[PDB]
Design an enzyme around this catalytic site. Sequence first.
Site, PDB file in Angstrom:
ATOM      1  CB  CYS A 110      66.884  35.187   9.126  1.00 26.56           C
ATOM      2  SG  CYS A 110      65.699  33.964   8.449  1.00 26.56           S
ATOM      3  NE  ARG A 113      70.506  34.482   7.396  1.00 25.49           N
ATOM      4  CZ  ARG A 113      71.746  34.817   7.735  1.00 25.49           C
ATOM      5  NH1 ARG A 113      72.504  35.485   6.874  1.00 25.49           N
ATOM      6  NH2 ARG A 113      72.242  34.466   8.937  1.00 25.49           N
ATOM      7  CD1 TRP A 282      58.954  26.908   7.932  1.00 23.24           C
ATOM      8  CD2 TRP A 282      58.436  27.427   5.813  1.00 23.24           C
ATOM      9  NE1 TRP A 282      60.002  26.513   7.138  1.00 23.24           N
ATOM     10  CE2 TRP A 282      59.711  26.821   5.834  1.00 23.24           C
ATOM     11  CE3 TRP A 282      57.896  27.832   4.581  1.00 23.24           C
ATOM     12  CZ2 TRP A 282      60.459  26.616   4.674  1.00 23.24           C
ATOM     13  CZ3 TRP A 282      58.640  27.628   3.429  1.00 23.24           C
ATOM     14  CH2 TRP A 282      59.909  27.020   3.485  1.00 23.24           C
ATOM     15  CD  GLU A 287      59.794  31.792  14.752  1.00 24.41           C
ATOM     16  OE1 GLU A 287      59.734  33.021  14.568  1.00 24.41           O
ATOM     17  OE2 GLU A 287      59.713  30.962  13.823  1.00 24.41           O
TER      18      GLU A 287
HETATM   19  C1  HEM Z   1      60.742  30.217   5.686  1.00 23.93           C
HETATM   20  C2  HEM Z   1      60.983  29.930   6.968  1.00 23.93           C
HETATM   21  C3  HEM Z   1      61.625  30.929   7.965  1.00 23.93           C
HETATM   22  C4  HEM Z   1      62.035  30.571   9.182  1.00 23.93           C
HETATM   23  C5  HEM Z   1      61.978  29.158   9.813  1.00 23.93           C
HETATM   24  C6  HEM Z   1      62.570  31.737   9.840  1.00 23.93           C
HETATM   25  C7  HEM Z   1      63.085  31.746  11.110  1.00 23.93           C
HETATM   26  C8  HEM Z   1      63.439  32.870  11.814  1.00 23.93           C
HETATM   27  C9  HEM Z   1      63.624  32.969  13.251  1.00 23.93           C
HETATM   28  C10 HEM Z   1      63.465  31.832  14.293  1.00 23.93           C
HETATM   29  C11 HEM Z   1      63.985  34.224  13.528  1.00 23.93           C
HETATM   30  C12 HEM Z   1      64.271  34.782  14.943  1.00 23.93           C
HETATM   31  C13 HEM Z   1      63.144  35.766  15.266  1.00 23.93           C
HETATM   32  C14 HEM Z   1      62.598  35.562  16.654  1.00 23.93           C
HETATM   33  O1  HEM Z   1      63.130  34.687  17.389  1.00 23.93           O
HETATM   34  O2  HEM Z   1      61.631  36.284  17.020  1.00 23.93           O
HETATM   35  C15 HEM Z   1      64.022  34.975  12.287  1.00 23.93           C
HETATM   36  C16 HEM Z   1      64.356  36.299  12.139  1.00 23.93           C
HETATM   37  C17 HEM Z   1      64.289  37.013  10.953  1.00 23.93           C
HETATM   38  N1  HEM Z   1      63.768  36.554   9.746  1.00 23.93           N
HETATM   39 FE1  HEM Z   1      63.575  34.603   9.193  1.00 23.93          FE
HETATM   40  N2  HEM Z   1      62.482  32.819   8.982  1.00 23.93           N
HETATM   41  C18 HEM Z   1      61.889  32.361   7.812  1.00 23.93           C
HETATM   42  C19 HEM Z   1      61.607  33.171   6.729  1.00 23.93           C
HETATM   43  C20 HEM Z   1      61.957  34.500   6.569  1.00 23.93           C
HETATM   44  C21 HEM Z   1      61.654  35.299   5.396  1.00 23.93           C
HETATM   45  C22 HEM Z   1      60.827  34.732   4.211  1.00 23.93           C
HETATM   46  C23 HEM Z   1      62.153  36.536   5.599  1.00 23.93           C
HETATM   47  C24 HEM Z   1      62.125  37.773   4.672  1.00 23.93           C
HETATM   48  C25 HEM Z   1      61.733  37.692   3.398  1.00 23.93           C
HETATM   49  C26 HEM Z   1      62.821  36.538   6.894  1.00 23.93           C
HETATM   50  C27 HEM Z   1      63.475  37.578   7.502  1.00 23.93           C
HETATM   51  C28 HEM Z   1      63.878  37.595   8.824  1.00 23.93           C
HETATM   52  C29 HEM Z   1      64.494  38.721   9.487  1.00 23.93           C
HETATM   53  C30 HEM Z   1      64.824  40.080   8.830  1.00 23.93           C
HETATM   54  C31 HEM Z   1      64.740  38.371  10.759  1.00 23.93           C
HETATM   55  C32 HEM Z   1      65.416  39.239  11.845  1.00 23.93           C
HETATM   56  C33 HEM Z   1      64.577  40.419  12.319  1.00 23.93           C
HETATM   57  C34 HEM Z   1      65.476  41.287  13.166  1.00 23.93           C
HETATM   58  O3  HEM Z   1      66.548  41.749  12.672  1.00 23.93           O
HETATM   59  O4  HEM Z   1      65.105  41.515  14.343  1.00 23.93           O
HETATM   60  N3  HEM Z   1      62.665  35.297   7.433  1.00 23.93           N
HETATM   61  N4  HEM Z   1      63.684  34.111  11.256  1.00 23.93           N
HETATM   62  N1  LIG Z   2      58.718  45.626  21.354  1.00 19.91           N
HETATM   63  C1  LIG Z   2      59.669  45.615  20.388  1.00 19.91           C
HETATM   64  C2  LIG Z   2      59.806  46.706  19.535  1.00 19.91           C
HETATM   65  C3  LIG Z   2      60.783  46.688  18.548  1.00 19.91           C
HETATM   66  C4  LIG Z   2      61.609  45.577  18.436  1.00 19.91           C
HETATM   67  C5  LIG Z   2      61.438  44.507  19.306  1.00 19.91           C
HETATM   68  C6  LIG Z   2      62.325  43.291  19.192  1.00 19.91           C
HETATM   69  N2  LIG Z   2      61.481  42.087  19.318  1.00 19.91           N
HETATM   70  C7  LIG Z   2      62.019  40.976  18.515  1.00 19.91           C
HETATM   71  C8  LIG Z   2      61.395  40.948  17.135  1.00 19.91           C
HETATM   72  C9  LIG Z   2      60.829  42.089  16.560  1.00 19.91           C
HETATM   73  C10 LIG Z   2      60.260  42.052  15.292  1.00 19.91           C
HETATM   74  C11 LIG Z   2      60.249  40.853  14.595  1.00 19.91           C
HETATM   75  C12 LIG Z   2      60.798  39.714  15.174  1.00 19.91           C
HETATM   76  O1  LIG Z   2      60.784  38.551  14.470  1.00 19.91           O
HETATM   77  C13 LIG Z   2      61.464  38.621  13.236  1.00 19.91           C
HETATM   78  C14 LIG Z   2      61.035  37.528  12.305  1.00 19.91           C
HETATM   79  C15 LIG Z   2      61.116  37.851  10.972  1.00 19.91           C
HETATM   80  C16 LIG Z   2      60.753  36.928  10.017  1.00 19.91           C
HETATM   81  C17 LIG Z   2      60.345  35.670  10.400  1.00 19.91           C
HETATM   82  C18 LIG Z   2      59.989  34.779   9.399  1.00 19.91           C
HETATM   83  C19 LIG Z   2      59.580  33.510   9.777  1.00 19.91           C
HETATM   84  C20 LIG Z   2      59.532  33.172  11.125  1.00 19.91           C
HETATM   85  N3  LIG Z   2      59.116  31.927  11.456  1.00 19.91           N
HETATM   86  N4  LIG Z   2      59.880  34.070  12.089  1.00 19.91           N
HETATM   87  C21 LIG Z   2      60.280  35.318  11.748  1.00 19.91           C
HETATM   88  C22 LIG Z   2      60.621  36.258  12.722  1.00 19.91           C
HETATM   89  C23 LIG Z   2      61.378  39.751  16.433  1.00 19.91           C
HETATM   90  N5  LIG Z   2      60.481  44.543  20.261  1.00 19.91           N
END
Ligand code: HEM
Ligand SMILES: Nc1cccc(CNCc2cccc(OCc3ccc4ccc(N)nc4c3)c2)n1
Lengths: 411, 411
Positions: A110, A113, A282, A287
């Site tokens: 993430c 963070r 947000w 994304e």
């Molecule tokens: C507040 C603004 C936030 C921004 C800008 C942000 C941004 C991102 C981005 C760009 C990713 C990459 C996911 C992707 O590319 O699909 C990500 C992943 C992730 N975010 Fe953050 N996020 C935010 C808030 C949060 C919050 C509030 C949580 C949990 C309470 C969180 C938990 C996670 C987790 C667990 C992942 C990784 C999921 C995985 O392991 O595949 N995020 N975030």
């Molecule tokens: N078919 C499938 C099945 C399982 C896994 C995948 C992997 N696929 C990438 C993926 C999966 C799930 C979530 C995700 O995103 C994570 C995320 C979390 C929090 C966020 C908070 C804010 C923000 N702006 N973005 C966030 C993104 C990515 N694929």
Amino acid sequence: RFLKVKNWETDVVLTDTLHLKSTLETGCTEHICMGSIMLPSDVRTKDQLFPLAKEFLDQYYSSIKRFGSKAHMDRLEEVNKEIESTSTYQLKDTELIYGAKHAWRNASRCVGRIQWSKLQVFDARDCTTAHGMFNYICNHVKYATNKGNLRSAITIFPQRTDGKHDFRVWNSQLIRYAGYKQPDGSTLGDPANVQFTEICIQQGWKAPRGRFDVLPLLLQANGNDPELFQIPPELVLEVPIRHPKFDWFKDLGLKWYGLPAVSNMLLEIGGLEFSACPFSGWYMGTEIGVRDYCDNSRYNILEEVAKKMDLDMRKTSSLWKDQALVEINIAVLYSFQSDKVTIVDHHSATESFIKHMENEYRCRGGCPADWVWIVPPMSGSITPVFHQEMLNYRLTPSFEYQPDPWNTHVW
Amino acid sequence: RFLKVKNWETDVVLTDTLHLKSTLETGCTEHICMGSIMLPVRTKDQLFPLAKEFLDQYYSSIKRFGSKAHMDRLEEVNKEIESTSTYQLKDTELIYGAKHAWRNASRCVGRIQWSKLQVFDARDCTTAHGMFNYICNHVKYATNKGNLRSAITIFPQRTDGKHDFRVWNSQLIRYAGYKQPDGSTLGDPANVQFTEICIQQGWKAPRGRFDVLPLLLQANGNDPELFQIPPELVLEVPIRHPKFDWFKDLGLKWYGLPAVSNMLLEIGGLEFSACPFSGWYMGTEIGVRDYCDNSRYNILEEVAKKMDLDMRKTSSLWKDQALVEINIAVLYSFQSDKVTIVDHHSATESFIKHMENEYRCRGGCPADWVWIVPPMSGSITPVFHQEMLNYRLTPSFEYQPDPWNTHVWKG
Ligand code: HEM
Ligand SMILES: Nc1cccc(CNCc2cccc(OCc3ccc4ccc(N)nc4c3)c2)n1
Ligand code: HEM
Ligand SMILES: Nc1cccc(CNCc2cccc(OCc3ccc4ccc(N)nc4c3)c2)n1
Ligand SMILES: C[C@H](O)[C@H](O)[C@H]1CNc2nc(N)[nH]c(=O)c2N1
Ligand SMILES: C[C@H](O)[C@H](O)[C@H]1CNc2nc(N)[nH]c(=O)c2N1
Ligand SMILES: [Zn+2]
């Protein structure tokens, strides 16, 4: 084994000791690195649970500067007795909030963070029905949306007991657009959501069959069959996408929703498993603009945009895809900013993450970080994270992946 | 034991068994991933097993495993090791080893070409002047008036580490960099330290913006000597843009031949500390990294100004926009001058085909996602969505310390 990470743009060197606290496993070995594998990897027996709780409570009481105190030892004994008897235990509210904030703090993938401690935690552990879950989720969506001044939040439903009574949100995000297979072969709407859009229809949902149909919620309480609910439209804030230079961009008829709210992960705190814990922040603009709009297996709008730009699409070396990709991402940011909906660009967010890394190394001794996911999907090397070495390791509390419910549920 | 990788854009799954042949260590463990770390006098004792392993691989490839030729060669090498402490490769073994070191380079996206490498045996070289002659001939052969050809030139192997052959340049052709008293840098910032050594060794610096550096060549452990590559052998390309007539007036050019010269080639336990090799450029190496890295020529600002972009806020993606244009200009200039170059879309698509073919005929293809994914527009290339396994195979190219830090000066 007190490892160092170098930033090759700035020569700043940070020393990592936090990784020695790591418990779980990476999937790598000394012979093979699995750092680009998307996902490596029933109830907890009475034995493995107390060590998990002890380690969690140990770090909790340290954080409040009460390590080795009366309250600490008493709570240790109290949980120890509750596990011996009930074969599980309940978190105090203070412990629940700490666990959730640190699951985010520890999310090595993430980039957002720096905000980890400003998380609004909604305790939904008293919930019993899908209708109740619906109510909690509407309240979450409204609170987090905040008329475009988005606020981070998590809602935590009751913890897993024996794997038969699981609470589960079947949607991958609370708000996502439907996807339908066409008779000719193509796909209308979001191709990522075709199987889910089928399950909803194959469940009762009357689909409008539009390009941006907000999917219904599909909520599972206590392991019963899931139930369909429609989120009130006035709670779903959406941004029409237009371009500050190109008037024809509006004509494309694109929009996206403001609230990214991931609902399919599992939250692990002190050995306890919260299978339903939708959380939201947000967006970072890429994304939507890079992945959602331009992935070949998604909305895949790259050809149309370049055509309307009258770019030379005959040879890859004209970089017409790169040119269009930038304009699309300028439009997304411009649209959200114009409509006063929170959004961060990839330059701001990665700069923030570098500062967050420095903070964590200073005040905590480290920051687990997954370079493959932290580096944005466009313009990688002109963002500061590209040149930053990162150590990836798994700390707890944590968010984990879990199987899709329809592959598991005894229907 | 078998391992799977999945392409998430195409759902193609591949099965790796080649990782079982891996000997060297990655740097990772079950509890930490070092996948984003840039960098994670052998004895008679450890040398014959390394030789045997190589000769087993070599004779397998020519379908002669266990043959009399195979067994005799093993005996011959064994006696040569115990009697002379080292051994000499045959020409066939050297060509095979150099090609497979390239084939095994998990960070190299251009490996579809690995079997078409011109190998120049320079093991009879004895002086720096001889090295100069060998390198001039390499540059002329590889350049081929713009129709680039891959090549490697291999100088004598290490003996006791006190008589190393080394090319002190990091690349055969590179532009000087000069730190000015006012803190500014003229030329290429990446080459300031090497430029200083050259100036100290007697090089008369023109002190211009694109000065080709002299070769600094070390033979048999002697002090290195300076030589000037004949300018007619150094092919350069003026950078212009196909739509922006003002781009030429930025006064940019780049050289045509990328020729890395500071790596160590390991074959059968033998170490070749001087082994310059060359192919042709992917456009982003010049346009993204060389020109737009903040720590390099860093022309983003000038280009953005001449394009008159909104440079006040980063969310205007002025940096992204200028980056695309610069990379368009690099590819346009090279193609117009008929100097071989490949764009990052073509190169990554070819790598995917290479990788799938390697899984079929070889059982795997070690690959470093962090390096394979291009430094711009990552997710619109097919490698972004491709899972990869990274592991170390030999023959290999390794990093080695810069010679000026280890050399014992003769005077
Ligand atoms: C507040 C603004 C936030 C921004 C800008 C942000 C941004 C991102 C981005 C760009 C990713 C990459 C996911 C992707 O590319 O699909 C990500 C992943 C992730 N975010 Fe953050 N996020 C935010 C808030 C949060 C919050 C509030 C949580 C949990 C309470 C969180 C938990 C996670 C987790 C667990 C992942 C990784 C999921 C995985 O392991 O595949 N995020 N975030
Ligand atoms: N078919 C499938 C099945 C399982 C896994 C995948 C992997 N696929 C990438 C993926 C999966 C799930 C979530 C995700 O995103 C994570 C995320 C979390 C929090 C966020 C908070 C804010 C923000 N702006 N973005 C966030 C993104 C990515 N694929
Ligand atoms: C034929 C055209 C070739 C292309 C287009 C190409 C492309 C690339 C690129 C873009 C990189 C990443 C380096 C960076 O971004 O700084 C790379 C790495 C590398 N290339 Fe290739 N390459 C080619 C030929 C070769 C040849 C002929 C060799 C050796 C005989 C080679 C060996 C390597 C090695 C060892 C690395 C890893 C360097 C490291 O670990 O720092 N490449 N290549
Ligand atoms: N500051 C520092 C300090 C220490 C190490 C580094 C690593 N620094 C990246 C680097 C170094 C040397 C060479 C290199 O390139 C590899 C390469 C090889 C063959 C190619 C053939 C064609 C082509 N087009 N490119 C190639 C690139 C990268 N950096
Ligand atoms: C920190 C990280 O290892 C380093 O910046 C890497 C990232 N990936 C790269 N990828 C390529 N192709 N070339 C590079 O120089 C780098 N640098
Ligand atoms: C193959 C690779 O693991 C996969 O495509 C990853 C790469 N990096 C990513 N990075 C982010 N931020 N989000 C993603 O979904 C992915 N996908
Ligand atoms: Zn690893």
